[PDB]
Subunit: 246 residues, 4 copies
């Protein structure tokens, strides 16, 4: 369903990004997955190979103006034009607002929201020239719902959806779609961090009565990347097991 | 010639209003994904034409008569399905009508027929199928809404009330049934090239394109792809959601 | 005050939220016609308004009946005057899991809570259009946006109310009539109680008067640029 | 001196309104003042701060005009310290200051992206952090953030503004969850298209097209946003928190 397309997936070394990279690969995409370190990029390349997926690893820091512009320029001139871009990379730095350090606020906004500008800007010319593209941004239920101790993360993740909607309006006439996928609580390193009794508490808020799997997010992203999703744009697709319904 | 099993292999799926338009495309897509597909029409001739369409496309299933506005018709048809093909584990509530008018000009029948066909049908169909899904510990209910539910539209207070009600229904039922691994979701199309949109005045359809970032009406196949995805186990963690499929005409 | 000279019609005004809405519009200077299903309720409305120094009347009204509404409003508009503020608040619940739900439980909630909007709105729009001013305010529920197990009928009706609100707002805006919804959370009208409060950031149930204050504001000239809105009044239980 | 008026809904509350020198923030400062608040309004220039002071005085409102740049960590720190040391502890805070730097994303310069997020979104962290301890000690507060219909709707040419304004709502909801137990509400108001300098800058052809999208068939007035903010600041809205109230003439309905 994606044969002949190049996909770029940011944050593909583990968790949701890794499942996304493998799923797009399963669909026939050549996959460029990113990590913040050389060894991470090397491991991505090997993991894709181990799964029979063609592609490469890329060292990328989406919080850095230079790391994005320079690395994307290189790939587009020398290797090829990504027509599917999944902005998956993201971090949390939680604290009540009165206890939150300046770096905790700015690092989350800069990594999780400003990254969308850096990546999208680097890839849009190729998509507009091809008259085809998919930009898929990984948001969070916390964007719609809010969560105490996460004003920075809620701000960035809600901002991600606003970005999604406005860009979908700019590029729709060139058959590029822009969508968000907002996971609920998914079994990854990010969630394994939370204290035990808080995870037991989260389950009581979820109608399906379980955490989600990274593969479940990846399936949804794989669908949006496909031709069958061509009339879906500016949407946020919640994948949260019923934790939040809007 | 033994093909590979597809994502819905062997599941019995019921699609209301599969005689034409979005419902027909949904029926064919679920059939492509390996479901046994029962599609319905409001007349015997429509039911026969569904059976012919399924066979021409190599889909196992049946065409049946169903009027979702009628308690007696839902009961009779669902009894027949349970007896002759089995209990549906995928149900797509697609049947719907419009009876447009400004509220001050609206006739009682225009209000009540739209609420009764588009909203009360969700109670009739879901009540009939839920016990089978709960016993199987798996199910998919997918309700076809409309952008008009979220956005509103002049001349469509009846339709907007019904289609927004469909989303409230979807969210509440998702909460009742999640613990049995049944998901309940809505898909809200924008403006799709079907008989329904082709009914609107020419000048209105052209003004419509200017509001849609993609610059075109959607195709029925584009809604059907989304529904086929939600029916699969790839969408098992999606419940109580409304997925807009409107070409960016409305973003929420 | 801000509503002096206007007639307001408030359905379901015999207690709770509807009563508080009636009193608030009254305190703002409206002449208030509050409705009830029974003679006892209608007489209670009249007495309560009087006791609070509000001018108005009680009216027997069955919002589920095409005839009761159409006739009873035609009467008011020909003898008492023209309601320019209309609050649709009359509402019922019939709770049950969908698999256990009886036909009457589904249909009575949709007919009373949703179809009533059509009956009342149809009856009052001519007077508002002539006046070139109006307020229609529909009382929904957090259950509309959030869903609740055991209340598929109520959630359908109350979400339907918001869709009706937005579509009607589009129809009538050119005449300076606004149409809005207010969605209360859990309002004060002992183990599951502490569980419920844990879902509410403010940590308390709402007061009926807190809903009425929001309705009062939407009714005023200050809310003239608000239309097609749903205002949640739920202590942060649900955020949209 | 001999005339005593009735106390109003915000009587004696210290309020801070960022960007009160014109437009919506000016209307808001005057509305809060009419409601009995002591009003501190801010501008980015000494001239604008003087204009605020004079507008308040002409309207018989007690308060002050001050210079504040909400994009600057140092300006926010020093101004909020000055306010606490000599004016009062703001219990009502309206984050109204905001800008646009429009361009298609492919033509957008880095400074246009960053200035909009930094002015319109990062300002919420700067201001809220500076005022919360005062509200938590009083066990009462109101934070009211001025968003935009563009946050929910999106708009071509405004990816930066849409991201900032949608982020503002996410911030609102999360902060409302944190502070609710101290009876501090946090809400957003999302104007549509209001007759101010920001909208008057759009070309005439684009403004006339806008009117075709608005059911009420007119732009809103700054005073119409101010009335809504003044209500949310009152105890009449004590049970509303984490809400976004759209004030857009029906242009966008969510
Ligand atoms: N897990 C969950 O329950 C939820 C997750 N999400 C969102 O899903 C996305 C992935 O989450 P999850 O898989 O849990 O996260 P993990 O923390 O497991 O993985 C984070 C990934 O992002 C990469 N990354 C982090 N910072 C940067 C950066 N500055 N530049 C480039 N890459 C970076 C990491 O690279 P490396 O390995 O080099 O560090 C890694 O691949 C995130 O956007 C998260 O916010 C949303 C809702 C719920
Ligand atoms: N087309 C569009 O742009 C949009 C469509 N939708 C929704 O998508 C769904 C299908 O729309 P579309 O394909 O355009 O519609 P069509 O009018 O083309 O087809 C309607 C289908 O529903 C059936 N139907 C009508 N009334 C009943 C009834 N009482 N009981 C059972 N079946 C009935 C019809 O059967 P028969 O052939 O016997 O008449 C037909 O199969 C509807 O719910 C519609 O509201 C939502 C948004 C936009
Ligand atoms: N007008 C409209 O249709 C809409 C407006 N809005 C939002 O409403 C708010 C008010 O807008 P509006 O009145 O139209 O805008 P104007 O541009 O007319 O006024 C903006 C105000 O913000 C102040 N300001 C700008 N930058 C800063 C800064 N860095 N630090 C401190 N103050 C600053 C300005 O100060 P000074 O006078 O010194 O320049 C001015 O008082 C903004 O957040 C805007 O995004 C949202 C939707 C629609």
């Amino acid at each position: 369903s994606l044969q002949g397309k190049v996909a770029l997936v940011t944050g593909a070394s583990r968790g949701i990004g890794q499942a996304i990279a493998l799923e797009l690969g399963r669909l026939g995409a050549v996959v460029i997955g990113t990590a913040t370190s050389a060894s991470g990029a090397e491991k991505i390349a090997e993991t894709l190979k181990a799964n029979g997926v063609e592609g490469a690893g890329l060292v990328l820091d989406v919080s850095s103006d230079e790391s994005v512009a320079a690395t994307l320029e290189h790939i587009q001139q020398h290797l090829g034009q990504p027509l599917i871009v999944v902005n998956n990379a993201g971090i949390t730095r939680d604290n009540l607002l009165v206890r939150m350090k300046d770096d905790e606020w700015f690092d989350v906004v800069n990594t999780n929201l400003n990254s969308l500008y850096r990546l999208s800007k680097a890839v849009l010319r190729g998509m507009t020239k091809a008259r085809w593209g998919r930009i898929i941004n990984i948001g969070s239920v916390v964007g719609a719902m809010g969560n105490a101790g996460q004003t920075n993360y809620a701000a960035a993740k809600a901002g991600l959806e606003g970005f999604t909607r406005a860009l979908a309006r700019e590029v729709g006439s060139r058959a590029i779609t822009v969508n968000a996928v907002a996971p609920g609580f998914i079994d990854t390193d990010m969630t394994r961090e939370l204290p035990e009794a808080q995870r037991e508490a989260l389950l009581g808020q979820i109608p399906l009565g379980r955490l989600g799997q990274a593969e479940e997010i990846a399936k949804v992203v794989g669908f949006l990347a496909s031709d069958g999703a061509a009339y879906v744009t500016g949407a946020t697709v919640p994948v949260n097991g019923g934790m939040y319904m809007s």
